[PDB]
Design a binder for this molecule. Structure first.
Ligand SMILES: [Hg+2]
Ligand SMILES: [Zn+2]
Length: 257
C-alpha cells in the first residue's frame, strides 16, 4: 500500500486517495509575515493531568502512543476550538538527518521532527464519527529541534527497542504527555487534514510557535525503527513526512504578535 518510498511515496498517494489533491490539505508552510494576528483567539486550555496511556505500537509508518479516551481524561479546549476535544494518541514524523523531519515548515525552515497529539470532538461520540465532520479533529503540532535532551521523552525512547518492527506493540502505561510541552502556548491555526492516508479534511491545526529540544541521542533512537515487519529486509523508518501542500484559499491565524 502507501508509504514514503520512491514507488509508493507522497507523490503517488492521489491514486488511491484522490483527496490528496483537495482544497484543505496538510501540511503547509507557515509564512510568519502573512499570518494574521487574531486578537479574538482565546488561549489554549490543555488539561492532561488525568491522562491514561495504554500502549505503544509500530504501525509500519510511525509509532503510536495510545490513550484511554472513554472519558474526558486528557482534553484540549479553548484557542480556536468550540467544544472539548479528547486526546486519543500521539505520534511523530522525523527525518534521516537533523535538517529535515517536520511536516509543517516556518518560513520554509524545517525542523528535525514534529509531534502530533491527535484529539477528536466529543460532540461526535467516537473517533470514527468525528472523521466525518469538518470540525471533527484537533491536532496539536509541536516542533522538535536538536539540542539538549528532553527528560520527559526518555521513557518513550527507551521502549522503542521492543517495538522495532511493524506490528509490534508494548504496554505503555503511566506516561505523562505534559512532559512534551514547550514553555509557551502561543500558536498558529488553520483548517487542514491528516497528513497520512486517508488524508481526511477534518482537522483544525494548532501549531505551537516554540519548539522543544531533544538530544541527538534521543532522535537517533527514532531512526533505528523499521518500516518492514519481522523477517523482512531491513528498511529503516526515516523521512516519514509529507511535503508542504498549497495553501489555496486559506488564511493562517496567529494568537500572538
Ligand atoms: Hg471530515
Ligand atoms: Zn502526524
Amino acid at each position: 500500500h502507501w508509504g514514503y518510498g520512491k514507488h509508493n511515496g507522497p507523490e503517488h498517494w492521489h491514486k488511491d486517495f484522490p483527496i490528496a489533491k483537495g482544497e484543505r490539505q496538510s501540511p503547509v508552510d507557515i509564512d510568519t509575515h502573512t499570518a494574521k494576528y487574531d486578537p479574538s483567539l482565546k488561549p489554549l486550555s490543555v488539561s492532561y493531568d488525568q491522562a491514561t496511556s495504554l500502549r505503544i505500537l509500530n504501525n509500519g509508518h510511525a509509532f503510536n502512543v495510545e490513550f484511554d479516551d472513554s472519558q474526558d481524561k486528557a482534553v484540549l479546549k479553548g484557542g480556536p476550538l468550540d467544544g472539548t476535544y479528547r486526546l486519543i494518541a500521539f505520534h511523530f514524523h522525523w527525518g534521516s538527518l537533523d535538517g529535515q523531519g517536520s511536516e509543517h515548515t516556518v518560513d520554509k525552515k524545517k525542523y528535525a521532527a514534529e509531534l502530533h497529539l491527535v484529539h477528536w470532538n466529543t460532540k461526535y461520540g467516537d473517533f470514527g464519527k468525528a472523521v466525518q465532520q469538518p470540525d471533527g479533529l484537533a491536532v496539536l503540532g509541536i516542533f522538535l529541534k536538536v539540542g539538549s535532551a528532553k527528560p520527559g521523552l526518555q521513557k518513550v525512547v527507551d521502549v522503542l527497542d521492543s517495538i522495532k518492527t511493524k506490528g509490534k506493540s508494548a504496554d505503555f502505561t503511566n506516561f505523562d504527555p505534559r512532559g512534551l510541552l514547550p514553555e509557551s502556548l502561543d500558536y498558529w491555526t488553520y483548517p487542514g487534514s491528516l497528513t497520512t492516508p486517508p488524508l481526511l479534511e477534518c482537522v483544525t491545526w494548532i501549531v505551537l510557535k516554540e519548539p522543544i529540544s531533544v538530544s541527538s541521542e534521543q532522535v537517533l533512537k527514532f531512526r533505528k525503527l523499521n518500516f518492514n515487519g519481522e523477517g523482512e529486509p531491513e528498511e529503516l523508518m526515516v523521512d516519514n513526512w509529507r511535503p508542504a501542500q498549497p495553501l489555496k484559499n486559506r488564511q493562517i491565524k496567529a494568537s500572538f504578535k
